[PDB]
Design a protein around this nucleic acid. Sequence first.
DNA 1: TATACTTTGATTTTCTGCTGCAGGATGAAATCCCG
DNA 2: CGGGATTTCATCCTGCAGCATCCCCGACCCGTATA
RNA 3: GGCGCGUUUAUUACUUUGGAGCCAGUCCCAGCGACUAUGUCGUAUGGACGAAGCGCUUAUUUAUCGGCCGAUAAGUAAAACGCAUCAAAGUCCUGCAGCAGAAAAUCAAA
Length: 915
Amino acid sequence: EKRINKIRKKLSADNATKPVSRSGPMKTLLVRVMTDDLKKRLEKRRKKPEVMPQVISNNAANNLRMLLDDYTKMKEAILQVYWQEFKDDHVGLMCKFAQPASXXXXXXXXXXXXXXXXXXXXXXXXXXXXXXXXXXXXXXXXXXXXXXXXXXXXXXXXXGKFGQRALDFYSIHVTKESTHPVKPLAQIAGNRYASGPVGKALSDACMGTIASFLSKYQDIIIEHQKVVKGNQKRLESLRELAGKENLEYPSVTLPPQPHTKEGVDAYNEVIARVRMWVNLNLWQKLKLSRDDAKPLLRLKGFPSFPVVERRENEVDWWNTINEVKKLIDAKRDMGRVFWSGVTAEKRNTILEGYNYLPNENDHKKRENPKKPAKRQFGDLLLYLEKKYWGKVFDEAWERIDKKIAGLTSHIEREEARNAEDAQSKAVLTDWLRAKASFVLERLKEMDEKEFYACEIQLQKWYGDLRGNPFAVEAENRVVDISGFSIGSDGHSIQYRNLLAWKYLENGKREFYLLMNYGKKGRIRFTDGTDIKKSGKWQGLLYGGGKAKVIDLTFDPDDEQLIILPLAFGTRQGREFIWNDLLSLETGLIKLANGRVIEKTIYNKKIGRDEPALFVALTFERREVVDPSNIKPVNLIGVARGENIPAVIALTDPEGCPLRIGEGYKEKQRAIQAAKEVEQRRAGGYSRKFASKSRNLADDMVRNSARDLFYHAVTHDAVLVFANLSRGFGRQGKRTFMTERQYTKMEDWLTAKLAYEGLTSKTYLSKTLAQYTSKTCSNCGXXXXXXXXXXXXXXXXXXXXXXXXXXXXXXXXXXXXXXXXXXXXXXXXXXXXXXXXXXXXXXXXRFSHRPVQEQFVCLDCGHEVHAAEQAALNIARSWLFLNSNSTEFKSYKSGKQPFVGAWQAFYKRRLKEVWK
DNA sequence: TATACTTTGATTTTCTGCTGCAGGATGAAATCCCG
DNA sequence: CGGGATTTCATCCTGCAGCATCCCCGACCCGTATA
RNA sequence: GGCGCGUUUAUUACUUUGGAGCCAGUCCCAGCGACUAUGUCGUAUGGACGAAGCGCUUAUUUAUCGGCCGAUAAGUAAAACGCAUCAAAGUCCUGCAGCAGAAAAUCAAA
């Protein structure tokens, strides 16, 4: 009773249905094309198929290569010419992509006392439902709608929404007229692809991409205007250094608002220089806390123009290896006169301060730990200093040169045979960096002028040599299928693609995808109804608004007609090809769009270089359940977290009364530990678990969304989430992006709720997260007053005591926190409390949740899991918000804050009906 | 009893993945060549 | 002069919403051994 | 960690997550540790080599038993079957950015 398709057949089989209004919910297939290895997978089994289905016929693959390669070339040409348009005039291209308005009317005016940003910002009281005042500027009425007031209500020059079809791309490059000199269908594709579907799909893709770039660029220009205003407001760093008299000058002026991309680089360079100076001379040598001298923020978020502005820094491995060896062996003789020279004492400071000699690598936890190869050279230097300082350099150089020669001979004999050693490359780079950072100490002692030039060259070479043998080339290749429609004259296929389903022997089908992107016809159709055991080839082409299957006649020929046999499960087909509730060939689902994707999938037998072929037909729904349900006895309190996500508590409607996805952080910590142990040695990543964590996270999100949806439906309940303010994450030091999923569960639950009809007003509600997980379920904050008296505060709720136990660690520490309290209390206590952060002791002992699972109250003496207790607080916080009893009249009139009003609701209802 | 050592700040060079935004999920109609 | 291939052309969405919620680090980076 | 079966997720074969099944050694290269130090000994860290279910029918080769072949142990090869072995999920594309991981430099804090 706990599968997902049982719940959708519980929803869609107890109340009525209704058609959609304008658009619908979208799903997508992701079927794979049966090339050859999908048939090798079939002739390897125990039971074997009756009909060994089909294979890509070795000519369809060649024209797919031609089509995808021509498509990406045309995309790069269009994006390069609009990049050259964008670098010449920002606001011109922004005004080009604005939109048309609609089919409006004779709206209002605001010419006087209202201009623009970059020319007659009019107005209209559009929707009279609950929100009007749409500005919608003109002179093509560009729907400008902005002005966030604050200091000046200035409306945005370009519109509130950049658009896809604003430019009329099919009046430019693709048409035979219009002497714009860049024509992709003519110059690049060689005039052999049809200028119908190719030009319009390429239009849709390129214009959607530049619309997304401009729609990000406008907001980023606005937010960098705010950040540069705040950063000009934060040059009291010059005020403090004169205020403390200890520092002379930073000597740096800020540029204006950058606006290009390289201005952002110069601006953030100056910001980094000032920030490094502030950390070096104010945060450390003068011991100032961060939140007294606020630092300069960095301009982050500036987008780049999409495809053309990528890096492509590709270099070959052995040539850079020989370059590092050339730089090392050039300066060998100058290193000999240096290390045989100056002192014993200064040279010991070089050997000890620059991390050569091993500090504590002897802690043998059942063999020593390994050394980072700048310290193995230190051990060899120590042994040669004992046994043998001029000729120590020669023996050290010969030994490390023999190690280097053995490593490069092993990599040459293993790389150029069949495979990649994949770890000894990293060790060769580490030992080369060690030889470099041993040779360079003439320059790090004599003159630091040219020392930094060779250092940044060696840093670039080391970064190349460690990262570039693990970089992935060969990004995905997509072509689009923009719609399935019969033309105006009812005998044609506009966009020239179909879902075929040639009939097999008994009753089953084959389900090809037919593409005809050449400059010809080659597909025709009338109608049919027979079911004979041959190529009925039917089709589903969506005539007008109606859905119609056809009888289709064509011959497989090597000029056009990409014929892709699909491969999918019974699950995907049962879901949205032949679903017995939402059938095709009736119109309850309709196909909308399609692709063809050549992406790199992982094949286990070799490395990941196995590009497969997926299709991805995307579908829109047209039959939708009408909301006439209530969910009264409901209040399922979804309380989310990173350790255990989605903790569940179910109540009654008055408020009186599961750990979905329990073991989850351990699994991703194990995957992360595998990535980290494969990253330290063997400097890259080993591209096998390059999608393991995303697949685990997706499986958890979708299984937990299934479980939340199940417990919502079968117990006649409404889920109650907390307003986590999307984008919510811990965002610290050891905080991986794979456990930031407080938004993803809500997104997937809405996506399974938007599909199959419903909205976020019948099974999903959201309440405020203020002071949940903090109030005990039989008791009542964050204003822990330490103003009460050093021996023992008595608090508000009755009386307390002292005698603590603070377990502060991150080293080797623990405390009883009373003797230290008396030591920090001095005597007169006022001077103590002025000069103590010893409130941290009380806030570490007397706090709720000492360990980050449990909970301890301060007047109940109660122990709860603080996740079931958080869930009950969520399910009662929503019951407090929209129930006007007495106390929600307060906090809307502004009488009390939220805390006292919620406590007065809670302890009144805790004695009344225990809620 | 301090001097030796440790983790952590801030710049920088290379790569990776995962989320978080923004575009989207094109049918209808009208011209126009062409043999 | 109809068939088939190009060219244009354009469509809707309103909402109100206030400081913690996730985790955990700080705290003491001063401490601590030990020569 | 590696290698294979395949069931349920009310026409097909896809991408995944689980459960269960069987094998995880050799110093040949390299790493790393100790030093009797331009090397010797260890350590399975990485490449390379092999290890990767069982049972029932049918043809055979070898060893046992029987006075042309018959029945056992092993091995070969084939097809079909059974058991170990059992449940779930899928909404994608494009493009940027932001975080985090990983070493590696430089300048400092106590």
